[PDB]
Amino acid sequence: QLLPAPLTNDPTAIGPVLPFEELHPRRYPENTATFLTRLRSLPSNHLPQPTLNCLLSAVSDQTKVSEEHLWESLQTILPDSQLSNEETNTLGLSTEHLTALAHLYNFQATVYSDRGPALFGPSDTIKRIDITHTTGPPSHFSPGKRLL
After folding, report:
1. Which residue among the candidates 24, 46, 133, 140 is catalytic per the annotation?
2. Catalytic residue at 97?
3. When you count CB atoms within 10 A of the terminal residue's CB, does the N or C end of the chain come out lower?
4. 24, 46, 54, 69: which is the annotated catalytic residue?
5. Annotated catalytic, 54?
6. Compositional bias (Low complexity) at which positions?
7. CA angle in degrees (0–180, nearest 5) for 28-124-34
8. 10, 15, 20, 24: CA torsion to nearest 10
């Protein structure tokens, strides 16, 4: 709820801090796209791929979109401060990045977490994907449903 200083300082973005779903309206599942962001305005700086890339690997497997294209797409929609920071370098990408990808590639994901399944991404979409998440630690995303 409080305004994050790196976001308001981020010169890749413009305008006010607002929930993702206010800036990028879609039919998101409740309480998944409420996270604060700003409109991304500057073109891509071509950030290196994240070291903890398992979310990209998982979505890539399920969509047949390369991890590079997924990552460049994230740089079209999110400010850089929300893509490369202490959290993403130590914990990886999150379900908030999944929501952003789901808007950018028009899919809804079922995430099979340790606490059960949950929907991420707009419902006004045709494509459906399955993602597995384990809390660990470390947090790990994998493609498909929880087997074994």
Report:
1. 140
2. no
3. C
4. 54
5. yes
6. 1-7
7. 15
8. -130
Write out the DSSP string of the chain. -PPPHHHHT-TTEEEEEEEHHHHS---PPTTSS-SEEEEE-SPP--PPPPSS-HHHHHHHHHH---HHHHHHHHHHHS-GGGTSSHHHHHH---HHHHHHHHHHTTEEEEEEETTEEEEES-SS-SEEEEEEEE-SSSPEEEES----
Resolution of the determined structure in angstroms stands at: 1.7
CATH 3.90.220.20 fits 1-148, yes or no: no
Give the method of determination. Answer: X-ray
Rounded to whole angstroms, the Cα distance separating 101 from 84 reads 16
